[PDB]
Design an enzyme around this catalytic site. Structure first.
Site, PDB file in Angstrom:
ATOM      1  N   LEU A  44       0.835  -1.183   0.000  1.00 13.84           N
ATOM      2  CA  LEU A  44       0.000   0.000   0.000  1.00 13.84           C
ATOM      3  C   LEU A  44       0.878   1.244   0.000  1.00 13.84           C
ATOM      4  O   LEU A  44       0.467   2.222  -0.559  1.00 13.84           O
ATOM      5  CB  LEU A  44      -0.945  -0.024   1.214  1.00 13.84           C
ATOM      6  CG  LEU A  44      -2.062  -1.069   1.190  1.00 13.84           C
ATOM      7  CD1 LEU A  44      -2.965  -0.915   2.391  1.00 13.84           C
ATOM      8  CD2 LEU A  44      -2.884  -0.991  -0.084  1.00 13.84           C
ATOM      9  N   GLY A  45       2.052   1.241   0.631  1.00 16.96           N
ATOM     10  CA  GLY A  45       2.900   2.424   0.648  1.00 16.96           C
ATOM     11  C   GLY A  45       4.325   2.126   1.105  1.00 16.96           C
ATOM     12  O   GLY A  45       4.619   1.003   1.493  1.00 16.96           O
ATOM     13  N   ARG A  46       5.203   3.134   0.999  1.00 15.70           N
ATOM     14  CA  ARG A  46       6.574   3.077   1.494  1.00 15.70           C
ATOM     15  C   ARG A  46       6.800   4.425   2.169  1.00 15.70           C
ATOM     16  O   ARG A  46       6.236   5.408   1.702  1.00 15.70           O
ATOM     17  CB  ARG A  46       7.563   2.771   0.354  1.00 15.70           C
ATOM     18  N   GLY A  47       7.543   4.471   3.285  1.00 10.33           N
ATOM     19  CA  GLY A  47       7.587   5.702   4.075  1.00 10.33           C
ATOM     20  C   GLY A  47       8.779   5.867   5.031  1.00 10.33           C
ATOM     21  O   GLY A  47       8.572   6.288   6.190  1.00 10.33           O
ATOM     22  N   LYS A  48      10.000   5.576   4.517  1.00 10.19           N
ATOM     23  CA  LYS A  48      11.282   5.953   5.120  1.00 10.19           C
ATOM     24  C   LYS A  48      11.638   5.013   6.266  1.00 10.19           C
ATOM     25  O   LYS A  48      12.738   4.470   6.249  1.00 10.19           O
ATOM     26  CB  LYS A  48      11.321   7.396   5.652  1.00 10.19           C
ATOM     27  N   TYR A  49      10.720   4.862   7.241  1.00  8.82           N
ATOM     28  CA  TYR A  49      10.896   3.976   8.383  1.00  8.82           C
ATOM     29  C   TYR A  49      10.094   2.675   8.243  1.00  8.82           C
ATOM     30  O   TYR A  49      10.362   1.709   8.957  1.00  8.82           O
ATOM     31  CB  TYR A  49      10.598   4.835   9.623  1.00  8.82           C
ATOM     32  CG  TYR A  49      11.674   5.890   9.887  1.00  8.82           C
ATOM     33  CD1 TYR A  49      13.032   5.556   9.824  1.00  8.82           C
ATOM     34  CD2 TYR A  49      11.351   7.206  10.219  1.00  8.82           C
ATOM     35  CE1 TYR A  49      14.028   6.487  10.063  1.00  8.82           C
ATOM     36  CE2 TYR A  49      12.339   8.151  10.461  1.00  8.82           C
ATOM     37  CZ  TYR A  49      13.677   7.786  10.378  1.00  8.82           C
ATOM     38  OH  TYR A  49      14.685   8.670  10.606  1.00  8.82           O
ATOM     39  N   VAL A  52       4.091  -0.535   4.059  1.00  7.54           N
ATOM     40  CA  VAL A  52       2.738  -0.864   4.460  1.00  7.54           C
ATOM     41  C   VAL A  52       2.106  -1.760   3.410  1.00  7.54           C
ATOM     42  O   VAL A  52       2.263  -1.523   2.223  1.00  7.54           O
ATOM     43  CB  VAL A  52       1.904   0.401   4.707  1.00  7.54           C
ATOM     44  CG1 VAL A  52       0.481   0.027   5.077  1.00  7.54           C
ATOM     45  CG2 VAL A  52       2.541   1.268   5.790  1.00  7.54           C
ATOM     46  N   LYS A  67       2.197  -3.073   8.827  1.00  6.01           N
ATOM     47  CA  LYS A  67       3.275  -2.097   8.677  1.00  6.01           C
ATOM     48  C   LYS A  67       4.598  -2.753   9.055  1.00  6.01           C
ATOM     49  O   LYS A  67       4.887  -2.938  10.231  1.00  6.01           O
ATOM     50  CB  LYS A  67       3.001  -0.882   9.567  1.00  6.01           C
ATOM     51  CG  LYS A  67       4.060   0.215   9.586  1.00  6.01           C
ATOM     52  CD  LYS A  67       3.642   1.418  10.452  1.00  6.01           C
ATOM     53  CE  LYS A  67       4.792   2.275  10.957  1.00  6.01           C
ATOM     54  NZ  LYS A  67       4.319   3.288  11.931  1.00  6.01           N
ATOM     55  N   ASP A 155       3.929  14.546  14.487  1.00 10.27           N
ATOM     56  CA  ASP A 155       4.019  14.389  13.008  1.00 10.27           C
ATOM     57  C   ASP A 155       2.628  14.494  12.397  1.00 10.27           C
ATOM     58  O   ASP A 155       2.284  13.648  11.568  1.00 10.27           O
ATOM     59  CB  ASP A 155       4.716  13.099  12.575  1.00 10.27           C
ATOM     60  CG  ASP A 155       5.330  13.162  11.189  1.00 10.27           C
ATOM     61  OD1 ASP A 155       5.563  14.280  10.700  1.00 10.27           O
ATOM     62  OD2 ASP A 155       5.565  12.089  10.610  1.00 10.27           O
TER      63      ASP A 155
HETATM   64  C1  LIG Z   1       3.772   5.233   4.172  1.00  9.46           C
HETATM   65  O1  LIG Z   1       2.387   5.625   3.970  1.00  9.46           O
HETATM   66  C2  LIG Z   1       1.927   5.629   2.706  1.00  9.46           C
HETATM   67  O2  LIG Z   1       2.591   5.327   1.746  1.00  9.46           O
HETATM   68  C3  LIG Z   1       0.483   6.084   2.631  1.00  9.46           C
HETATM   69  N1  LIG Z   1      -0.433   5.412   3.573  1.00  9.46           N
HETATM   70  C4  LIG Z   1      -1.709   6.118   3.859  1.00  9.46           C
HETATM   71  C5  LIG Z   1      -1.668   7.626   3.845  1.00  9.46           C
HETATM   72  C6  LIG Z   1      -2.728   8.258   2.949  1.00  9.46           C
HETATM   73  C7  LIG Z   1      -2.682   9.800   2.863  1.00  9.46           C
HETATM   74  C8  LIG Z   1      -3.882  10.461   3.496  1.00  9.46           C
HETATM   75  N2  LIG Z   1      -4.072  11.857   3.004  1.00  9.46           N
HETATM   76  C9  LIG Z   1      -5.522  12.190   2.834  1.00  9.46           C
HETATM   77  C10 LIG Z   1      -5.906  13.519   3.426  1.00  9.46           C
HETATM   78  C11 LIG Z   1      -5.698  13.805   4.774  1.00  9.46           C
HETATM   79  C12 LIG Z   1      -6.209  14.959   5.358  1.00  9.46           C
HETATM   80  C13 LIG Z   1      -6.947  15.872   4.602  1.00  9.46           C
HETATM   81  C14 LIG Z   1      -7.554  17.043   5.297  1.00  9.46           C
HETATM   82  C15 LIG Z   1      -6.771  18.136   5.669  1.00  9.46           C
HETATM   83  C16 LIG Z   1      -7.348  19.261   6.239  1.00  9.46           C
HETATM   84  C17 LIG Z   1      -8.712  19.314   6.452  1.00  9.46           C
HETATM   85  C18 LIG Z   1      -9.506  18.241   6.091  1.00  9.46           C
HETATM   86  C19 LIG Z   1      -8.937  17.113   5.520  1.00  9.46           C
HETATM   87  C20 LIG Z   1      -7.135  15.577   3.236  1.00  9.46           C
HETATM   88 CL1  LIG Z   1      -7.906  16.708   2.168  1.00  9.46          CL
HETATM   89  C21 LIG Z   1      -6.631  14.423   2.664  1.00  9.46           C
HETATM   90  S1  LIG Z   1      -0.644   3.826   3.297  1.00  9.46           S
HETATM   91  O3  LIG Z   1       0.665   3.258   3.194  1.00  9.46           O
HETATM   92  O4  LIG Z   1      -1.559   3.723   2.204  1.00  9.46           O
HETATM   93  C22 LIG Z   1      -1.457   3.155   4.710  1.00  9.46           C
HETATM   94  C23 LIG Z   1      -2.745   2.617   4.575  1.00  9.46           C
HETATM   95  C24 LIG Z   1      -3.420   2.162   5.706  1.00  9.46           C
HETATM   96  C25 LIG Z   1      -2.811   2.248   6.968  1.00  9.46           C
HETATM   97  N3  LIG Z   1      -3.385   1.868   8.194  1.00  9.46           N
HETATM   98  C26 LIG Z   1      -2.545   2.104   9.161  1.00  9.46           C
HETATM   99  S2  LIG Z   1      -1.002   2.796   8.725  1.00  9.46           S
HETATM  100  C27 LIG Z   1      -1.512   2.784   7.065  1.00  9.46           C
HETATM  101  C28 LIG Z   1      -0.827   3.244   5.950  1.00  9.46           C
END
Ligand SMILES: COC(=O)CN(CCCCCNCc1ccc(-c2ccccc2)c(Cl)c1)S(=O)(=O)c1ccc2ncsc2c1
Length: 331
Positions: A44-49, A52, A67, A155
């Protein structure tokens, strides 16, 4: 002389009043679950540390996220696990379900409840003032909860907030930088991602607290309503404080360093210069007006403030007029 010390205006002694095991995480033994219960489906993702994956638990056939950690000091893994356990079941807090070691790779792997994250395409273009108010409220529920449980996230940023818009759900994730608040404690300042670092970090003021989170919440609110991601767009850590100074003005900044007797890297003195605090209206256009409102800007102004002690708390934030509709539509 040295810097003037600081306490948190709220939740100050919360961890002191708890058993040491609550916060003394170095103490924490980890019981490894059985890595054969889960089969990984797709990355699902990659994130330095960490990486996922979506995976499935063949015990019961529930979808799940794993993770896999990259090497980090055990003390930091312990820290993440304790905070997750301490916070589990709390509002909009991700739920740690299991912990597993590969028997060979020896890499530890946190397993979580499945949550879907709707694409940032369908999200950003369709959000609307209301939806942002809603989800900011949801984030404040989590921040007030973790702050009240003696934990700062350290963070907060879009990448650590997952929104499942189909089910109007939100989860605050990636707790691997969170740390416990203790009155007196000097903390590490090179934490958070650059656009979201509060000024305390940028000036090397270490005695910070939950208030750090509220600055980054502001950074998020800013880029949402003005549709300017990232809002403070510094080229390095120094220039980041310059970008802030160019909006919040240099006068309030130096008052801040004075109040707390902070020693500023001479480097900054030749970069900050003299700048006026800007009114928010110069970030408003036709493309974003629909998100900007007097209440939005009152709320934002009261987060994005150099002095950590003068930012809103999570609770205060939740009581602001900006949310009056979401608190009524939820009762
Ligand atoms: C290393 O990480 C990644 O590669 C990305 N991940 C998920 C992150 C997805 C990004 C989310 N951004 C959406 C977002 C967030 C907040 C707002 C917002 C801001 C201000 C006001 C209202 C909303 C918005 Cl617009 C979008 S991920 O790897 O897949 C993932 C998926 C499921 C999960 N469950 C536990 S840890 C985990 C990680």
């Amino acid at each position: 002389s040295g810097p003037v010390p600081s306490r948190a205006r709220v939740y100050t002694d919360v961890n002191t009043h708890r058993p040491r095991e609550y916060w003394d995480y170095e103490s924490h033994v980890v019981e490894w679950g059985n890595q054969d219960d889960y089969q990984l489906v797709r990355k699902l993702g990659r994130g330095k540390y960490s990486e996922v994956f979506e995976a499935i638990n063949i015990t019961n056939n529930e979808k799940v996220v794993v993770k896999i950690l990259k090497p980090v000091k055990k003390k930091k893994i312990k820290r993440e696990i304790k905070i997750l356990e301490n916070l589990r079941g709390g509002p909009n807090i991700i739920t740690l379900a299991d912990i597993v070691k590969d028997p060979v790779s020896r890499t530890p792997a946190l397993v979580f409840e499945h949550v879907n994250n709707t694409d940032f395409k369908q999200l950003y273009q369709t959000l609307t003032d209301y939806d942002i108010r809603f989800y900011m409220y949801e984030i404040l529920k989590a921040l007030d909860y973790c702050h009240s449980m003696g934990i700062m996230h350290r963070d907060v940023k879009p990448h650590n907030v997952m929104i499942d818009h189909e089910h109007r759900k939100l989860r605050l994730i990636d707790w691997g930088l969170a740390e416990f608040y203790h009155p007196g404690q000097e903390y590490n300042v090179r934490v958070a991602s650059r656009y979201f670092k509060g000024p305390e970090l940028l000036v090397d003021y270490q005695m910070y607290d939950y208030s750090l989170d509220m600055w980054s919440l502001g950074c998020m609110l800013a880029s949402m309503i003005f549709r300017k991601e990232p809002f403070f767009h510094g080229h390095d850590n120094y220039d980041q404080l310059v970008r802030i100074a160019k909006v919040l003005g240099t006068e309030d900044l130096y008052d801040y360093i004075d109040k707390y007797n902070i020693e500023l890297d001479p480097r900054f003195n030749d970069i900050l210069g003299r700048h006026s605090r800007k009114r928010w209206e110069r970030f408003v256009h036709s493309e974003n007006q629909h998100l900007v409102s007097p209440e939005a800007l009152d709320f934002l102004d009261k987060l994005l403030r150099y002095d950590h002690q003068s930012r809103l708390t999570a609770r205060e934030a939740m009581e602001h007029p900006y949310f009056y509709t979401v608190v009524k539509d939820q009762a």
